[PDB]
């Protein structure tokens, strides 16, 4: 279609605060070799992050507040804040823009919500499908074709496996695998119907604003790099590597502020630390 509605709105999008925030620097087309920078400048350069919904305000999926926020401050966003954004270049750039919903479920059980964030890519030099998942928190770095690759391959240093099986009706789930603390595990699974900006805003009302949601109670950052992943998860802190290892770190209150700037490039007001440092989600 031609509505506005059923696209990434990536005019309102200031392509070159973006590229330059994130690091860009290759030829601006819709090639697989931009995508392939795209994905990889944005995954290791964006912080994660659900403060705004600790602090009880709103996280909103405007442009206006996605650049203010991520491109502008030293804040991070979780799947939406970070996929919307990343949808908007995309388009920008001349890209096959089409969105996903798949349910997170890293090794759980039972029938996750399908609140996270996928965008399935098309370049110019084929007609390749290409996902690319820029809001998880832990890449991956570069987009995974979107076809059956059930033996371990790897994005970056990190193993990977792409898993196509069946659902109800006779329909596609694919599960993305990836190999960490735990060993291997399934990270989510998700479906190829066409989502769209506002199916983002029922999934981003709802994981910003539900008791049922975790994300919603305690801080939860993850940074990513090339070579390693942070996470804080509570005050917890972990920091882990590609062969799988990693080392973690129990925190105190006071240590927050500290890690938070170092470790996640993320900067609050002192209110807000303050009201972090304080929050009763900490006596959980």
Known sequence: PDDPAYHWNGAELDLDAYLARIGFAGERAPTLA?????????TTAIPFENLEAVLGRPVRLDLATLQDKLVHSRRGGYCYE????????????????????????????????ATHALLRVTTADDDRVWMCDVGFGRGPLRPYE????????????????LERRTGE??????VLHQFGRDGWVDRYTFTTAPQYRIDFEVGNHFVSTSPRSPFTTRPFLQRFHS??????????????????????????????????????????????????????????
Do not use: C, K
């Not at 931009?34 to 944005?42: G, I, P």
């Not at 908007?88 to 997170?104: N, P, S």
């Open 34 to 42: 931009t995508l392939r920078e795209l994905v990889y400048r944005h």
């Open 82 to 113: 970070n996929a919307g954004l990343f949808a908007a270049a995309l388009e920008r750039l001349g890209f096959g823009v089409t969105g996903h919903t798949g349910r997170v479920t890293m090794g759980a059980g039972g029938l996750r919500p």
């Open 146 to 161: 979107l076809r059956p690759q059930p033996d371990e391959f790897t994005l970056g240093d990190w193993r990977f496996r």
């Open 169 to 174: 009706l006779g329909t596609d789930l694919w």
């Open 227 to 284: 070579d390693r992943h942070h996470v804080l998860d509570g005050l917890t802190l972990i920091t882990e590597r590609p062969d799988g290892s990693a080392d973690i770190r129990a925190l105190t209150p006071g240590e927050l502020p500290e890690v938070i700037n170092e470790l996640f490039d993320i900067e609050l007001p002192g209110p807000d630390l303050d009201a972090l440092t304080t929050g009763s989600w900490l006596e959980r």
